Amino acid sequence: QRSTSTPNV
Amino acid sequence: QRSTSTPNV
Amino acid sequence: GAMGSMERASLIQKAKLAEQAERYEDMAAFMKGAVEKGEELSCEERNLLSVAYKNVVGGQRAAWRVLSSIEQKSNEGSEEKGPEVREYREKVETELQGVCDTVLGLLDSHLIKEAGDAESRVFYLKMKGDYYRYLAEVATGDDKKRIIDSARSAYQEAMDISKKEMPPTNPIRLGLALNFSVFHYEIANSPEEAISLAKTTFDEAMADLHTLSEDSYKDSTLIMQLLRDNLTLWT
Amino acid sequence: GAMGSMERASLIQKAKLAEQAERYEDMAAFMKGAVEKGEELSCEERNLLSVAYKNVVGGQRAAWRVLSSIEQKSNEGSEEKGPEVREYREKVETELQGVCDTVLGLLDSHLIKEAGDAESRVFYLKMKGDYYRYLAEVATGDDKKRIIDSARSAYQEAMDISKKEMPPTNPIRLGLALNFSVFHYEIANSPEEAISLAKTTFDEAMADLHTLSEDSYKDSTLIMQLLRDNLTLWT
Numbered sequence: 001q002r003s004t005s006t007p008n009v
Numbered sequence: 010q011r012s013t014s015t016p017n018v
Numbered sequence: 019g020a021m022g023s024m025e026r027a028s029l030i031q032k033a034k035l036a037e038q039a040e041r042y043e044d045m046a047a048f049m050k051g052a053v054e055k056g057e058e059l060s061c062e063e064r065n066l067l068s069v070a071y072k073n074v075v076g077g078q079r080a081a082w083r084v085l086s087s088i089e090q091k092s093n094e095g096s097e098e099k100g101p102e103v104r105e106y107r108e109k110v111e112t113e114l115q116g117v118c119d120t121v122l123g124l125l126d127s128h129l130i131k132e133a134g135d136a137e138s139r140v141f142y143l144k145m146k147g148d149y150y151r152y153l154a155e156v157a158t159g160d161d162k163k164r165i166i167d168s169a170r171s172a173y174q175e176a177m178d179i180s181k182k183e184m185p186p187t188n189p190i191r192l193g194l195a196l197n198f199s200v201f202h203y204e205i206a207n208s209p210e211e212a213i214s215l216a217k218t219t220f221d222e223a224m225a226d227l228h229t230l231s232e233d234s235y236k237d238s239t240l241i242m243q244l245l246r247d248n249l250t251l252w253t
Numbered sequence: 254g255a256m257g258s259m260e261r262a263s264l265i266q267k268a269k270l271a272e273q274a275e276r277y278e279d280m281a282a283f284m285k286g287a288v289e290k291g292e293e294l295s296c297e298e299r300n301l302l303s304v305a306y307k308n309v310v311g312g313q314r315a316a317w318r319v320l321s322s323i324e325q326k327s328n329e330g331s332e333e334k335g336p337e338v339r340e341y342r343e344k345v346e347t348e349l350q351g352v353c354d355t356v357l358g359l360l361d362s363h364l365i366k367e368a369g370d371a372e373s374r375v376f377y378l379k380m381k382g383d384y385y386r387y388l389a390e391v392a393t394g395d396d397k398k399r400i401i402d403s404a405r406s407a408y409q410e411a412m413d414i415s416k417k418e419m420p421p422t423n424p425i426r427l428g429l430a431l432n433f434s435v436f437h438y439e440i441a442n443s444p445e446e447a448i449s450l451a452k453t454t455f456d457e458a459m460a461d462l463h464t465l466s467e468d469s470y471k472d473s474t475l476i477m478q479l480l481r482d483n484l485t486l487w488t
């Protein structure tokens with residue numbers, strides 16, 4: 001599973 | 010609410 | 019056009035890849051290229067064409083509805099915000115119309131005229147009805163009535179063939195009837211016609227389910243549920 | 254370019270409309286036009302720029318991953334299917350690279366050089382790191398090492414400023430640290446560096462939460478949870 005980067009907000 | 014038309018399959 | 023140099027089979031292969039990648043604009047371009055090779059399309063290839071353009075126009079229709087709603091609200095106590103909402107709604111609308119015109123163009127040059135089997139001819143005429151219906155959704159001018167009539171005429175021709183040539187459970191026949199019922203309800207201001215068509219279609223399909231294999235039964239009942247969903251919404 | 258004739262404020266207004274309509278390619282084009290007016294961007298306008306391009310490149314990255322996986326499988330007992338998978342992966346890759354180059358171009362001409370406040374400068378340097386990282390995801394050639402180093406250098410400059418100029422709970426500082434940790438883990442083959450950065454970032458933010466209003470607390474803790482999610486994944 002891929003690491004999470006900063007999402008849109 | 011909108012009527013449902015044929016979906017993709 | 020731009021796909022002129024690519025093999026038909028490669029266009030079909032790439033359409034399938036684009037579908038997997040959820041790249042529907044690419045998928046549509048590949049399938050337009052395939053149609054423009056001039057050969058008739060198989061059932062699977064018609065499905066690829068359908069999926070690609072439905073997804074493209076579907077996104078445009080959703081965007082158009084968002085923008086139209088904002089525009090309507092602007093025209094109620096509303097503060098003046100200038101021409102931008104209208105301009106941008108118009109931009110999206112023009113693009114949507116362009117996609118519809120592209121599909122109608124493929125149908126007219128020359129998919130429909132070469133389609134002689136019931137499955138192909140009904141499918142293409144349904145598609146013609148659908149894309150005129152999408153044009154009708156955004157029409158307001160001198161031409162809205164003619165667009166509506168064009169949709170009606172395509173659906174009616176498809177209906178006439180489907181009733182003569184296909185069993186009542188045939189998925190193309192069912193999907194056509196579903197969409198023509200939506201036309202009646204949403205476009206033609208004919209809710210009673212819509213309800214009648216959906217009811218009759220459902221009932222005649224129900225009576226023919228016994229003739230079907232397990233797999234065909236699954237296909238037919240899915241669309242029948244959509245008829246039922248609309249009947250519930252409409253009554 | 255094509256947005257040269259539109260007012261800055263109209264481009265911003267239309268970017269917001271495009272966001273509402275989930276029209277992210279349009280949103281990106283409007284915000285590119287706004288940047289090219291030559292004025293600095295506010296925090297809200299930087300957010301619009303960010304959202305637009307993140308959504309565009311995000312779809313490209315997802316598509317690229319699908320196609321790369323199909324391509325890898327083709328190269329295992331696999332039957333030869335010709336050049337189409339590679340060609341189409343290359344097409345998507347080229348488009349992705351183009352978007353990255355466009356963003357990096359805006360940053361270089363002239364967003365970064367005019368950014369003197371910590372929030373703006375850190376944000377833009379983070380963005381530079383991110384888009385080099387996306388280039389690195391698809392790089393295989395003579396240049397992969399240099400692309401990685403370019404990402405690293407941008408993130409490091411951003412990190413240095415953020416540590417000096419922003420509290421440990423600042424969302425831009427936190428998001429930068431999150432993304433630089435992902436760089437370390439996913440790109441630079443440095444999982445220990447990734448874990449260390451995520452841990453230290455989380456812990457220093459935790460210790461500063463007491464200084465925050467309810468609303469700022471919400472913002473900081475959201476990103477902290479993402480650090481924690483990655484730490485859980487990575488350990």
Ligand SMILES: *CC(=O)N1CC2(C1)CN(S(=O)(=O)c1ccc(I)cc1)CCO2
Pocket residue numbers: 015016017018060061062064065066068069137138141144189190191193194240241
């Ligand atoms: C075999 C053939 O020509 N096909 C075209 C189709 C398969 C069916 N169409 S459709 O719009 O008629 C349709 C029927 C049932 C369902 I559930 C969805 C759509 C779509 C493309 O593939």
Ligand SMILES: *CC(=O)N1CC2(C1)CN(S(=O)(=O)c1ccc(I)cc1)CCO2
Pocket residue numbers: 006007008009295296297299300301303304372373376379424425426428429475476
């Ligand atoms: C105020 C300012 O310059 N902003 C840019 C931002 C608000 C924040 N970035 S971000 O990538 O730094 C980010 C931080 C926290 C979260 I949750 C997501 C993203 C995104 C654009 O808006």
Ligand SMILES: [Cl-]
Pocket residue numbers: 105106109267
């Ligand atoms: Cl516009």
Ligand SMILES: [Cl-]
Pocket residue numbers: 032340341344
């Ligand atoms: Cl290609």
Ligand SMILES: [Mg+2]
Pocket residue numbers: 025026
């Ligand atoms: Mg040939």
Ligand SMILES: [Mg+2]
Pocket residue numbers: 095096097
């Ligand atoms: Mg007022």
Ligand SMILES: [Mg+2]
Pocket residue numbers: 108111112
């Ligand atoms: Mg118009």
Ligand SMILES: [Mg+2]
Pocket residue numbers: 260261
């Ligand atoms: Mg001006």
Ligand SMILES: [Mg+2]
Pocket residue numbers: 330331332
């Ligand atoms: Mg074999």
Ligand SMILES: [Mg+2]
Pocket residue numbers: 343346347
């Ligand atoms: Mg390449």
